[PDB]
Design a protein around this ligand. Sequence first.
Ligand SMILES: [Zn+2]
Ligand SMILES: [Zn+2]
Lengths: 142, 142
Amino acid sequence: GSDYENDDECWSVLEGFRVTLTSVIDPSRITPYLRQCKVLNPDDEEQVLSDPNLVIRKRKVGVLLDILQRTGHKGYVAFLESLELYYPQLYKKVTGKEPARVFSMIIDASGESGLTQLLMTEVMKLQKKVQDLTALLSSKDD
Amino acid sequence: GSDYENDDECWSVLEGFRVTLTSVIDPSRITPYLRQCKVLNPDDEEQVLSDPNLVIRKRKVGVLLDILQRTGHKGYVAFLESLELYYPQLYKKVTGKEPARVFSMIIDASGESGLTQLLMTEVMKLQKKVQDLTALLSSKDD
Ligand SMILES: [Zn+2]
Ligand SMILES: [Zn+2]
């Protein structure tokens, strides 16, 4: 079957890629989204955000996988929820195929209006990010 | 602010800013949204995109206002809602206050999953525009 089971061993497809996941991904951006999926506890995001910066990001994602696997297949798909939104190429490599978009986890967990609020604020951050980049683009250090 | 009745009288709020809305807005980004708002028909998106560039973008939104006036309050709310997502400062000036967040129109029209998919792709067009600007913030004509 296609991963329909619910167990911690589900992570096998992500684990052999954690070498890249720890050096590329920053839990400091994805941990509030993992709250919406109801897999990540408030204690988990606190202990990972013990450093608010991206200094210890290598050990952050490493312990974060070990955190989300405590909920089994739940934390697996939840990591994919945050991943397909924030790191799409990281999903493409861990699975070997295109973004599936199994966002029915966060839909069931936080609600359709929950994910609508998430995406709606993310497009405002991105609308802000466009003017943020063209501001520094118009005046560089060359 | 806003109203409940179905007529051209509904538009009188947006009319005072019409000259700015027609020169600033591009139907090319708001037309696929207005499809899911169920106010814009497959003929209208064609007539405004008859010019692929920004050559006559002034009269594109001008004729689009007339399209959405046929549906009175439907097209009024739909233009507000697309303006609220795509042009936040234009919505801010036309209403006189912060985004009210009356996305309940496209929620009732295309469903919560409809707007969730529109926002999930909207973040990718913004990831495209943000990568477009960091590409130059990485390397310019200098
Ligand atoms: Zn699984
Ligand atoms: Zn009205």
